[PDB]
Structure formats: structure tokens, C-alpha cells
């Protein structure tokens, strides 16, 4: 009985493969060949942030594009005034094993998580003056790889139990758990319209969810190893992943397949962080060989390199206004590039 | 010229001072990654040592020991084992009453790229009742290729040698020890290994070693 429908499942997989093959009448490489190259982009470290003491693992920008978030092994979640290199807050963590952080789009709340299996949400704009913890979201059975705010009252967390979930911060319950990943989810990014998101697990597959229906809409499986980072294209109709095989791949939602692969023969180290630019022409990827690369997302050429970190870069993200990109590394240093 | 909001800079400097004080306070603590098989005596060894992820902390001879039982994560080890880099030692413990799962885990954690230069404190826990097992079920049952005397001492030595044979880097040490669940001495062994590691790190920082 199991094989009777396993054959049907294999037939369905072959059918979707044939459909995607038929839909690929061309490729991005031979369509964007007439576009002039973006050239060589040289970025200089405008500001460096030297507050942390051990292994910054995560980072998130504010919506105002001036305030950062920084989560390190030191057990501190210090948010920076990036313009003046000031520390406007210093949140001590209950557990120093932090793997992710997020800044709410309104700027009121900052989240955190890690090996403690709990997404603890910290209220910044408190009447008491200090930064208390508002809610401790529990229910996951794996390390929290990533977490992002839909708004002040909804957060979606990607955990290490091969599931992602959508939480109600006011009540603290799992409003809608997402399942379908065979391996543990390691990354997560939300669409600009916020109606849907994607997640990349260690099964070398990135799936398209939707926060309202709760089902899985499409699956992209072009990689070969564990996926460590995902980011949408700015228009929300494509996204770029990053895995341990040192290749970043750009999948497009409409054609449901893979458009381009950003791989070079001189790099054999996996990507830890990926983010686009404001226009979407660039593609900033943070590699394990201590340095970041910027990729011409429409031509796959290495536009430039962002070196200056003495250890593996673990986080990377451009601001909403696209003015600068921040890279955090295991050297406990943050740098702002322009 | 800063405005009257240079109090923001003052607050930033106060935050930096608090961060530096907290960092120098935390550096004085010793971090141990406790590791092993399921029901291998980790709970027993922590309970005898005076007290998701669970951290056990105790003080012995003016050292603050922090033991992290990372056995509570039933996920892919490689995706979070890089968190426990830069620990002083790995207090790996096995159950002699068992086994090849322990050998596989030891091989995985001894040659890991992050833990190449990290010392391992190996505990052959529960060696009091291993005599009962070896008196009725010889080590040939657990190790088919083992040939030789079936005495308690020789069997324990063979198991210890098998565990130490999974070590390849000559720059790391494996302080093997036997617990027999009586304990009251594992703290001393961990303290001596941590003292060796601390002295080696101090020599490394000064360029001597």
C-alpha cells in the first residue's frame, strides 16, 4: 500500500520536473548578456563597532536604518547607534548560546534565541526605563536558527526541529506551525508584502510558505548541501540562498525553478549570510573564508570583495534605505561598508 | 561639537564599562563541554560534582567550573557544535557497563575541525559494576576482534586504548580516568586537567608555547 502511492509520488516528482524543464525556454545568463556590467564596486569600512567580546552570531538592522542589533556568545544583545558608534542599549541574556536576533519593524521590540529553544522578546520602549523581557516563546524542540517579526504582535521562528512556527506574542502560543522540512531549518526570510516567506533547511531545499493559509506553496531544491541563509529579491518575486557547497543560487517564484548560480572555483567554503541591495542588482554573500563577496545578481560576476574580517562572517544585512551594509564576524567585530 | 545630547555618549561609555567588567568577570570562569552517550553517567557525574541545553556550575579551589550538557539537542550536531568552540576542555564520559556509539561519537568529536586543539577529559564512568559484566559477559562479546586476557584490568586497558586510538592530532591530550560512581575525586581530575590547559594557554599567550 505504501509503495502503491510512493510510485504515484515519484510520478508527481517527475511531472513537476518535466513542467519546470518545459518552462525553461531560456536562462538568465543568455538574457542579461546585453546588460552592461555593474563594474567593480569597492566598499570601505566607514564605521567599525568594537563592543562585543566573543563571536557575533547574528545581526539585524532597524527600519529607521540607523539602529543595529548584535547578538554574540558573550550573552549581550547590544543595539548600536550606527551613525555615531554609540551603544543605546545593552541587554544581558539568560542564555549566552544565541544564534539569532531581530529588530521589530516598529522598533519597539527586539527578539533573540538560540540553543535554549526559546524566543525571548525584549521590550525596548518600557516606562520603567530598562529593557525587560516581554514574552518567552516556548514550544520548539530545537535550536532557534532564525526569527523575524511580521509586526509588533506576530513573529515567525525557524527552529532546529525541522519546523517553523508563527507565534502570537500577546498570548505566547504557536498560532500556526509549519512542517514539511525533512532537515532542521537554518534560515528564514520574509517577503516585502509579508504575506509569505521562505525557509532553508539542511535537506538542501528551500520551501515557500504562506503565513495565512499555513501550507507549503512551492519547493526549491537546487542545492547540494545544508542551506545557511536566504533573502528575497527586493520585489519579492525571487530569492537567493546560500549553502555549504560555496554556491549561492537565485530561484524565481513564478517559474518555480533556479535561475542562476553564483559559484567560483577559488572558493570552497560555505556561505553563512546572504542579502541583496536596495535595487537588487547586487548580491552580498558572507563566506567562511573571513571575507564577504558582492555578486552581480544579473550576471553572476564577482563585482568585488569585502575583506577586513579576521574570522568567519556570521551575519550580513543591508539597511532599508540601501545606504550601507553591515557585516558581523566571529572576531567579535561589526563593520559598516559603503 | 556635540549637542546637549552628549549624555548619549556618556551613557555609551557607561555601557562600555559595564560590558568590560562583565567580560572580565566571565573570563575568570572555566567552561567545560560535557559530552557522551545517553545514560552514560553524565547526570550521575554532575550530581556527584556537588550539584534543552542545561548548564551546571560549581566552584572547586577558586575556579568557577561551568558544565554544559549539550546532550539535550536532538538535532544535527554540526550545525551548533561551532557554538562550543573555545571551551577549555571536553569532559567526555562513557559507560563501561555497555558501546560502539560512544566510540563513533568520540571519533567524531576528537577529529572535529573546531576541536583539534581542545583537550579531552575522558571518564570511564561506572567501572564499579563493569567487573560484574566482565565476569559473565567477556569483552569479546562487545569487541569481536579483541583477543587476549579477559581480566578486569586488561579489559579496561583495552577499552581505554580503543578510545585513545581515535585521536590523530598529537597536540591534544586525553586524560583518561575511571569513576566507579563513588566519585568524590572527579572534581580533582577535572581541576588538574583544567590547570594544565590554563598553564598551556598562558604559555601560548606569552609566546613561550
Amino acid at each position, epitope marked *: 500500500e505504501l509503495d502503491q502511492l510512493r510510485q504515484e509520488a515519484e510520478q508527481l516528482k517527475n511531472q513537476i520536473r518535466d513542467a519546470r524543464k518545459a518552462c525553461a525556454d531560456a536562462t538568465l545568463s543568455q538574457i542579461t548578456n546585453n546588460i552592461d556590467p555593474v563594474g567593480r564596486i569597492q566598499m570601505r569600512t566607514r564605521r567599525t563597532l568594537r563592543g562585543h567580546l566573543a563571536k557575533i552570531y547574528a545581526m539585524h538592522w532597524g527600519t529607521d536604518s540607523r539602529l543595529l542589533v548584535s547578538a554574540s556568545q558573550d550573552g549581550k544583545l547590544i543595539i548600536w547607534d550606527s551613525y555615531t558608534t*554609540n551603544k543605546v*542599549h545593552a541587554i544581558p541574556l539568560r542564555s549566552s548560546w544565541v544564534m539569532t536576533c531581530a529588530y521589530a519593524p516598529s522598533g519597539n521590540y527586539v527578539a533573540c534565541g538560540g540553543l535554549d529553544n526559546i524566543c525571548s522578546i525584549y521590550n525596548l520602549k518600557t516606562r520603567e526605563g*530598562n529593557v525587560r523581557v516581554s514574552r518567552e516563546l516556548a514550544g520548539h524542540t530545537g535550536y532557534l536558527s532564525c526569527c523575524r517579526f511580521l509586526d509588533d504582535n506576530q513573529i515567525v521562528t525557524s527552529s532546529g526541529d525541522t519546523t517553523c512556527a508563527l507565534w502570537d506574542i500577546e498570548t505566547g502560543q504557536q498560532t500556526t506551525t509549519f512542517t514539511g522540512h525533512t532537515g532542521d531549518v537554518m534560515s528564514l526570510s520574509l517577503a516585502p508584502d509579508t504575506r509569505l516567506f521562505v525557509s532553508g533547511a539542511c535537506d538542501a531545499s528551500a520551501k515557500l510558505w504562506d503565513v495565512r493559509e499555513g501550507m507549503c506553496r512551492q519547493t526549491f531544491t537546487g542545492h547540494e548541501s545544508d542551506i545557511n541563509a536566504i533573502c528575497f529579491f527586493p520585489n519579492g518575486n525571487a530569492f537567493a540562498t546560500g549553502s555549504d557547497d560555496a554556491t549561492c543560487r537565485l530561484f524565481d517564484l513564478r517559474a518555480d525553478q533556479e535561475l542562476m548560480t553564483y559559484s567560483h572555483d577559488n572558493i570552497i567554503c560555505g556561505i553563512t549570510s546572504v542579502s541583496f541591495s536596495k535595487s537588487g542588482r547586487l548580491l552580498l554573500a558572507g563566506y567562511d573564508d573571513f571575507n564577504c563577496n558582492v555578486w552581480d545578481a544579473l550576471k553572476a560576476d564577482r563585482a568585488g570583495v569585502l575583506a577586513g574580517h579576521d574570522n568567519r562572517v556570521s551575519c550580513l544585512g543591508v539597511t532599508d534605505d540601501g545606504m550601507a551594509v553591515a557585516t558581523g564576524s566571529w572576531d567579535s567585530f561589526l563593520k559598516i561598508w559603503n | 561639537l556635540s*549637542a546637549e545630547e552628549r549624555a*548619549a555618549l*556618556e*551613557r555609551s561609555k*557607561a555601557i562600555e564599562k559595564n560590558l568590560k567588567e562583565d567580560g572580565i568577570s566571565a573570563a575568570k570562569d572555566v567552561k567545560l563541554l560535557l559530552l557522551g552517550a545517553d545514560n552514560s553517567g553524565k547526570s550521575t557525574i554532575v550530581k556527584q560534582m556537588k550539584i534543552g541545553i542545561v548548564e551546571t556550575h560549581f566552584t572547586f579551589k577558586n575556579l568557577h567550573f561551568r558544565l554544559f550538557d549539550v546532550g539535550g539537542q536532538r538535532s544535527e550536531r554540526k550545525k551548533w557544535i561551532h557554538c562550543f568552540e573555545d571551551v577549555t576542555a571536553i569532559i567526555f564520559c562513557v559507560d563501561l557497563s555497555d558501546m560502539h556509539e560512544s566510540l563513533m561519537l568520540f571519533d567524531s568529536i576528537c577529529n572535529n575541525k573546531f576541536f583539534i586543539d581542545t583537550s579531552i577529559i575522558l571518564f570511564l564512568n561506572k567501572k564499579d559494576l563493569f567487573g560484574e559484566k566482565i565476569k559473565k559477559s567477556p569483552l569479546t562479546i562487545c569487541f569481536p576482534e579483541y583477543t587476549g586476557p579477559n581480566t578486569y584490568e586488561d579489559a579496561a586497558a583495552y577499552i581505554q586504548a580503543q578510545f585513545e586510538s581515535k585521536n590523530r592530532s598529537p597536540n591534544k591530550e586525553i586524560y583518561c580516568h575511571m569513576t566507579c560512581a563513588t566519585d568524590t575525586n572527579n572534581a580533582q581530575v577535572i581541576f588538574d586537567a583544567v590547570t594544565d590547559i590554563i598553564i598551556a594557554n598562558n604559555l601560548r599567550g606569552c609566546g613561550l608555547y
Partner: single-chain antibody
């Protein structure tokens, strides 16, 4: 909740000395930089002293420098203003005013109840209208100018609007000329350009009756105040 209570008021012969205590409870008193302002029985607010978080920086007004001193005890959560050589110009009510300074913060958010202490190159701001009659349901505008432009080089203009209802402590309404204080109704709105500033209230309510004070925070001053009468 947040609550600052002051003690130390009373009758003093001129030239003596007295200390005013500000017992603060309900908030992280250590990280806040508490101020101290005073208001004469028939006049407006007048800043007196200021001690930061950790007592690392302290400032005084010209008319009070030397005679007074400000001290904070974080473990006991009290603020002290030791006053020496009191004169008849110090007859006022002293308010213990909260303030926390960081990017996006709202200084002067909370104000103490006050203690009536009675005894037997500076930016000056002017509010032209001493008092303007108003009616409920209408829209009224209150404007004050400054001698020196309050717009710093970082794009922030440092103007704070305070409202003092009859017999009540002043409340922060607008900080930095455009940002509403937490809890203030959205009726109030701020505007201005460098030197000339204006505050507009849409659909005035009967509870908004009071004197409005605008203060500059560019450097180490209030205005006369425009009393609104229904």
C-alpha cells in the same frame, strides 16, 4: 508604577540652608539622569540643577551655581539638592524631573509632585501671548521663538513642549518639536524652523486647560508660558 515624590519643603529664614529629597520608585533610577527645576508661586519654570546617570556630569544655573549642589544615591533611590545661603529669590516649588538620554529617548518625560520651599551667551525663549482664550472643540495654536536657532548640525531641533494643568505637575507633550510623548493624545502637533516654533492643538478638549511651557535643550531655559482659559 513610576512615581517620584519630593520632600524637604518648609519655612526657612533667609541665608540658612536646607536639603530637598526626591524619593524615586518604580523605574531604573540608576540609568536615568534626574534634573531639578523650580517654579515661583506666580511665575514660570526655571531650571536649577542636573545630575546625570552615575553622577558623572553635573550642571547648575547661573543664579544657583555655588550655593546649591545636587547629589544622587542610587542604592537608596533618592535625589538630594543641598541648598545653602537661601535668599528670597528661592521661594518656589521644586520639581524632580526624570530624563534618560539616548537615541530616540524622551527626556523630561516624568515630573515629580513638588515641594513648596519658601523663605521669609544664554539662549532666551519668548512666548508672545501671555494668555489666549479658547473654547472646547476648537483648534488653537501656541507659538514660541528662540534667540538662537535650536536646530543642531545632526538634523535634530531641540524643543520640548510641556503642559501644566492647574494644580498639577508639568507633563511632556512634544519632544524635539515633532515627536509626541508616550500617552499624549494625537491632537497635539509640533512645527517650526530653526528659531520660530509653533504648537497646534486640533479639537481642543476641556481637559487641556493649562499653561504651556516650551523649553530649549540645545545647551545648558523655559518660556513665560501661554495660559489657555476655557
Amino acid at each position: 508604577d513610576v512615581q517620584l515624590v519630593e520632600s524637604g519643603g518648609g519655612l526657612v529664614q533667609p541665608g540658612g540652608s536646607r536639603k530637598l529629597s526626591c524619593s524615586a520608585s518604580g523605574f531604573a533610577f540608576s540609568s536615568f539622569g534626574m534634573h531639578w527645576v523650580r517654579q515661583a508661586p506666580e511665575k514660570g519654570l526655571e531650571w536649577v540643577a542636573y545630575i546625570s546617570s552615575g553622577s558623572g556630569t553635573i550642571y547648575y544655573a547661573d543664579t544657583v551655581k555655588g550655593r546649591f549642589t545636587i547629589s544622587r544615591d542610587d542604592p537608596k533611590n533618592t535625589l538630594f539638592l543641598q541648598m545653602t545661603s537661601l535668599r528670597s529669590e528661592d521661594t518656589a516649588m521644586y520639581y524632580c524631573v526624570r530624563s534618560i538620554y539616548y537615541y530616540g529617548s524622551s527626556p523630561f518625560d516624568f515630573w515629580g509632585q513638588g515641594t513648596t520651599l519658601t523663605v521669609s551667551s544664554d539662549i532666551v525663549m519668548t512666548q508672545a501671548t501671555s494668555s489666549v482664550p479658547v473654547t472646547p472643540g476648537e483648534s488653537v495654536s501656541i507659538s514660541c521663538r528662540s534667540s538662537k536657532s535650536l536646530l543642531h548640525s545632526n538634523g535634530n531641533t531641540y524643543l520640548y513642549w510641556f503642559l501644566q494643568r492647574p494644580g498639577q505637575s508639568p507633563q511632556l507633550l512634544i519632544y524635539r518639536m515633532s515627536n509626541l510623548a508616550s500617552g499624549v493624545p494625537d491632537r497635539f502637533s509640533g512645527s517650526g524652523s530653526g528659531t520660530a516654533f509653533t504648537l497646534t492643538i486640533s479639537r481642543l478638549e476641556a481637559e487641556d486647560v493649562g499653561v504651556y511651557y516650551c523649553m530649549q535643550h540645545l545647551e545648558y531655559t523655559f518660556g513665560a508660558g501661554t495660559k489657555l482659559e476655557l
